Each structure stands twice: as structure tokens, then as C-alpha cells.
Symmetry: D2
């Protein structure tokens, strides 16, 4: 089975790549070159060094993902004005447009798309959430499952072990066929 994971070199993505590599060849898109090397030590992990906003939004797609004709699992773990653009580009537009570019392969595999969800932070997380829900409704008939795993504070969210996010992802994709786990709310203890 085929998995694509963005933010693969962040704390969460590393744990997500290790989990999915049990039963998927994983395309792990990431920024950190040492983690990427470390990741390629895992069998069936295909590291892709990538500046994701530039590749997804400016160049029309990540070349090394272009040949995939079935994707089973796609996990999106990647002044003020410049700050708005940076956040919205990376947290909302890239998941939407990367999912669109992989759409044919997602339909073909009946895959699962999982999103990991100040004024700018509130807006983009509320944005990402409306994207997820409307996408889900657009694609349910095509066999695509859409899910949001939502970390947040109880205290602050950084105290969530990243492996628990990987487990949340594993729980979502493992759900039986008559089911969609559409949302999982995650908080520190």
C-alpha cells in the first residue's frame, strides 16, 4: 500500500512514517536532511527533500509523487501580512492543492486523507477544518475517507507525545469499511 506524508521530518511526521512503514511504502516529504537520511534507513521509506509550498503551489506538483497512480494514505503533517501568507499557504492551501493533485490516485485506491489540525492561528485552523469537511462531502461517493486529527491545549499541546498522533492515524486508517473516523480530538494529560 502507498502512503504520502508531509512534514515528515517534524516530531509527528517521524512517528507517522515509522508507523505506516509497517504496511505501506511511504513517501516522506520533509525539510530536515539528517532526519530524511535517518528516515531512509527504514525499509520501504522513500525520502523526498522538498520545499513543499514552492513545489505544491508554485510548480504544480512534487515530481517524485507524480508517478503514483494509487495513494492509500495521505497525511498532511506540514510583518503580519507575510505571516498570514506563510500560515495559510502551508496549513490550508497546500493540503487542499496537494490533495487535488493526488485526487486521481486517491480515488483509484479509495484512500484516506488525514489532516493534522493569535488571530492567524485561529483562522487557519478554522480554515483547515472547513476544508476537511467540504472535501469529505465532495469525495465520500468516490471511496475517499477524510479525517481530522485535532491536537490542542488542555496544558499546551506541545506536551502531547508525537507517537499518540501516529496511533491516532493508525486508528483512523484501520477502521472497517462501513465506517469513517472523521475526527479525533487529542489533548495533553
Amino acid at each position: 500500500k502507498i502512503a504520502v506524508v508531509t512534514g515528515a521530518t517534524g516530531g509527528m511526521g517521524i512517528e507517522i512514517v515509522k508507523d505506516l512503514s509497517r504496511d505501506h511504502i511511504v513517501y516522506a516529504l520533509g525539510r530536515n536532511p539528517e532526519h530524511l537520511a535517518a528516515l531512509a534507513e527504514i525499509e520501504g521509506v522513500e525520502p523526498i527533500e522538498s520545499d513543499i509550498v514552492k513545489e505544491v503551489l508554485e510548480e504544480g506538483g512534487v515530481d517524485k509523487l507524480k508517478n503514483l497512480d494509487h495513494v492509500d494514505t495521505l497525511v498532511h503533517a506540514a510583518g503580519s501580512v507575510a505571516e498570514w501568507h506563510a500560515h495559510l499557504d502551508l496549513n490550508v492551501i497546500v493540503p487542499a492543492e496537494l490533495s487535488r493533485q493526488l485526487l486521481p490516485a486517491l480515488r483509484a485506491a479509495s484512500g484516506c486523507v488525514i489532516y493534522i489540525n493569535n488571530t492567524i492561528y485561529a483562522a487557519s485552523k478554522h480554515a483547515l477544518r472547513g476544508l476537511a469537511d467540504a472535501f469529505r462531502k465532495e469525495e465520500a461517493n468516490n471511496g475517499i475517507r477524510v479525517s481530522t486529527v485535532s491536537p490542542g491545549p488542555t496544558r499546551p499541546e506541545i506536551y502531547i507525545e508525537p507517537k499518540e498522533i501516529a496511533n491516532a492515524i493508525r486508528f483512523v486508517i484501520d477502521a472497517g469499511e462501513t465506517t469513517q473516523i472523521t475526527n479525533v480530538d487529542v489533548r495533553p494529560r
Copy 2:
């Protein structure tokens, strides 16, 4: 570990008891005596035949639950007259049954899981308010509160198993389960 499950002879309840019995002694409260007998053949399963409204609301407690000093997991899976039936069973019973088990839950720092027409709407929102507010009240007392908001019965048991398997630093406060389409 000690688990208390209501609605234990419903489809959901049966699969929840089968799964929780892997690592818990399970006090299974339900209506159907034959399923109760069946469940009792599961190592550790304590069947309690119960009319839950009456015992919990009027009698002030379920008898076979009174000498427990630890509860690690409590799962609530159990027209004017209809309103009274729904609201009594969907809301007050979970509120009141949690209250009565509060000491054993704090002592265990345990987990409370609530499995979520016009009566149907108000009860499900009512259950959701109860849970989120009970979470706030018992946050500092070491009790964790979780909703499963739903479908194949085992998928519910899986969701419960995922909730309580959370590590030492995390909790799963809600899981939405929907039909495929």
C-alpha cells in the same frame, strides 16, 4: 483494572465487554439475562442484571457497585413520557451514575466515556453538554472524560479501546464515528 459498563447486553455493550475484559475486570450492567449469562463465561466478567434508571435514580445506587474503591473506566452505553424516558436514561443516569462513582474514579484517576426527531436532538446535545462540563469539574481531580459520537458495534469497541490506550501524557477527548457515506 476495573471497568463498569452500562447497556452491556446491547450490541455495542457486548463488544465493549469482550474488548475491555482483555485487561479489566468488567462489571457489566444490562437488561438481558441470557446475554448476561453468556458474558459471565468471560474470565473476570461480573454480570449485574439491572433496571438502570430505577436503581441509579431512585434507589441511589447499583448494589454490586457499592464496595468498589477503584474504577478505572466507566462507559455509559445504556411523548412527554418519551421525553422522560430518553432524558432519564440518556443524561441523568450518566450524570448520576458518574457522581455516585466519583470517589472510586478519583481514587483510580479513571476515565469516563459517554457513547452519544426532537427528543433525539435534545438528548444528544444534552449528553454532549453534560460531558464537556463534567470534564471541567473533574479536570483537577485526575478524572478524564471522553465522548464517542456515532454503525458496526465493534467499531465502537475499537474506538473505546483507542481512547483508553492513550499514553501517560495524552488523552483522547472525542472521536466522531460516521457511516462510510
Copy 3:
């Protein structure tokens, strides 16, 4: 125009009945006989002493409302023991009173407006779930449903109610969040 207001003798009720009396005959339900007497002084206001839980729920009706041929505006402003009282009064009564007046509401294409600790959370969400579902059930039958969700001078609530029912021909105001 005909109007029915519960908890009409509480702070909000009083102001709601005054404003509504400008263009409505108002049937004002209360238990304060002195405020009820007081209210009756206003033209167009016809007061009704009622033990509303007992009447709506246990006797299936409030007698003095039974004969109305339409209701243009209905406004709902009226421990285990604590669970029962609040749920009875905050949720079941508006559900049941509303059902009981269904034929008058349908006749007028009227407006139903609901004014929205563990108990307090639960009933306030129950009330909101009721209103939304009720809205969907009756949308096709001419009835408009609204909530006022105050999280305040009662006159402000009355103004919120007035703003809702006076809304244009093409528009419904389905919810208004009011804060201190």
C-alpha cells in the same frame, strides 16, 4: 397579531410583553399574581395565572390558550431533583407547549423564539438541539424558529426579539448571540 410569552412576569418577560403589546394582543403566562395584575394594566395584554410545568406537561395544556385561532409570536422565557426541575422547565415545556400550539402557529406562519452547572450546560445545549430540530421539522409548514442566546438588561433581550420578528420579507433571523 397574537402573542404568547412564558415567564412573562420575570425580568425579561415583562419587557418582552411591553414591546410586544405595541402591535400584538399578548397572552402573558406567569405565576406572580402581583406582576400579573401589574401587566394586565397594559392595553392588549391578557394575563394568565398558570403553574406551567403541571399544566403543559401533566395536564396536557394551558386552558386559556386552547382556543386561539393563531399565534404569530411564541416566546419561551419561562442533584436528581435539580435535574428534573430544570429539564422539565427549560426543555420539555418549550418542546411540549410548542407542539400543543402547533396548529395555531401553522395557521399564522408564526415565529417561535427560545431564549437560551453540569445541569446548566446540559439543558442549555438540549434547548439549542430542540430548537434546531424543531426548525427543520417545521420549516416546510410555514413556521420560523429562532434562538436568542444570551451569555444584560432585559430590555435588550426584548429588542433582540423585536429585531427578529420584524425581519424583512425574504429573511429569517435564526439566532442572535447576546453578551454583556
Copy 4:
């Protein structure tokens, strides 16, 4: 009083501008040069030709608004990567930045900001709402009121809702109004 209204030449904008001109001088931003002249025929309306994304986002302010030391009422009424950028720029980033830029004038007047609320359309309407609700919390202590008008499945009726919002009592805020056909 002083009002700033974006999208003044749009169908909503015109009726919001008319209603506000009763008790405000209205800075009415738009691109339509004929409708701007049309509106200029309403006394108390000082129209302002503008490419608002460019001026607010690139240039760091709308010129003809830089003099304002008080603003009472600010009203924001203005499937490809490019579509995403167009919509989110206009509907989210503009309102946050414009509000930020007028933040000194708004604090001085203790004024109110009103936001008038397909994968792109869901994402931006949720974004604006999240923008508005965090903004409100940020500025509550500084005396600014924040309100949303959330249309759903006649422009004058939007103008009326806005009038309802700004006219609220001394002790009361109207934070949100859900509107439907």
C-alpha cells in the same frame, strides 16, 4: 460618528452605506467608479476609489484613511491556487489587516468592527469566523466590540442587521447574527 465600509459599491455595500449615512460620515471604499459617483450623491458619503487588496496588503494602508483619529464603525463587506489566493486574500487577510491598521482609530472611539460572512468557500467562511472570534478576545479589554453577520442557505436586510448591531444598549453587545432566506 465615523464609519468605514469596504465593498461600498457592491449590492450590500450600497445599502449599508445609505443606512449608516443617517448618523455617520461614511468612508466608502470601492472600485466601481460609477457607483462611487452614484453614492457620492448621498450627503455624508466620502467615496474612495481603491484596489483594496493592493493598498491594504502591499502598500500598508488605504491613503485617504490615514487621517482618521477615531473610527466608530468599521464594516468589512468587500478551483485553483489562484482562486484560493484571491478569496483568502480578499476575505480574510484584508479584514484582519485593515482592522489592524485602524486599530488606533478604533480604540480611540471604542468602536465596533463588523464582519459580513466548494472547498474554498467553506474554508474561507470558517477562516473569517475564526479571525473574528480571536480578534474579539484580543481587543475586549481595549474597548472594541466585534460582531459577525453569518448569512446562510435583500441587501437592505443586511443593512438592518448591522444597524441592529451597532445600536445595541450600553450594557449589551451583539456578537453574532445568523441570517437565512
